[PDB]
Amino acid sequence: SMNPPPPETSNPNKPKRQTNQLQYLLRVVLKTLWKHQFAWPFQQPVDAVKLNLPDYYKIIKTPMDMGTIKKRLENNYYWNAQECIQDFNTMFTNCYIYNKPGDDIVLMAEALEKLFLQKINELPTEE
Numbered sequence: 001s002m003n004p005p006p007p008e009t010s011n012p013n014k015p016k017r018q019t020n021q022l023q024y025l026l027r028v029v030l031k032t033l034w035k036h037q038f039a040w041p042f043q044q045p046v047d048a049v050k051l052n053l054p055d056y057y058k059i060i061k062t063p064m065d066m067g068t069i070k071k072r073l074e075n076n077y078y079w080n081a082q083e084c085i086q087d088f089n090t091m092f093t094n095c096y097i098y099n100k101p102g103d104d105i106v107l108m109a110e111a112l113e114k115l116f117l118q119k120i121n122e123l124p125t126e127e
């Protein structure tokens with residue numbers, strides 16, 4: 001029933017880059033999803049205490065959210081685009097694992113995921 005520490009957004013030991021693909025993930029992909037009418041449940045870690053979800057972190061062992069992704073992109077946490085794409089996919093999958101088909105929160109995740117897929121289809125070739 002308590003909240004865990006949030007995912008890591010800072011680790012000096014971890015080697016970093018700023019590739020053209022990572023810049024597209026911030027300027028196009030994250031920005032498009034963040035401004036959407038359905039973004040709000042996904043803009044910060046799940047607060048299992050205030051939402052009264054005492055089983056959330058029993059079921060979900062790899063939590064992820066767009067607040068964490070935004071910080072990772074803005075503070076240059078990643079080496080490559082695949083690491084960041086994996087974080088978005090983990091966020092959607094967690095929502096579908098915890099909830100039921102047709103729930104409001106699932107419809108919201110599906111709308112954001114459709115846009116994610118349309119933008120990643122045009123990921124530029126790495127320069």
Ligand SMILES: COc1ccc2c(c1)C(c1ccc(Cl)cc1)=N[C@@H](CC(=O)N1CCC(N(C)C)CC1)c1nnc(C)n1-2
Pocket residue numbers: 040041042046047051053095098099104105
């Ligand atoms: C800050 O508010 C949040 C954050 C994360 C959420 C949720 C809400 C919203 C939420 C629900 C409806 C609408 Cl319209 C919008 C959101 N859902 C939660 C899930 C949720 O509360 N329950 C209600 C109680 C249920 N019993 C235990 C069976 C489980 C599902 C959630 N799941 N992933 C994320 C992200 N989320």
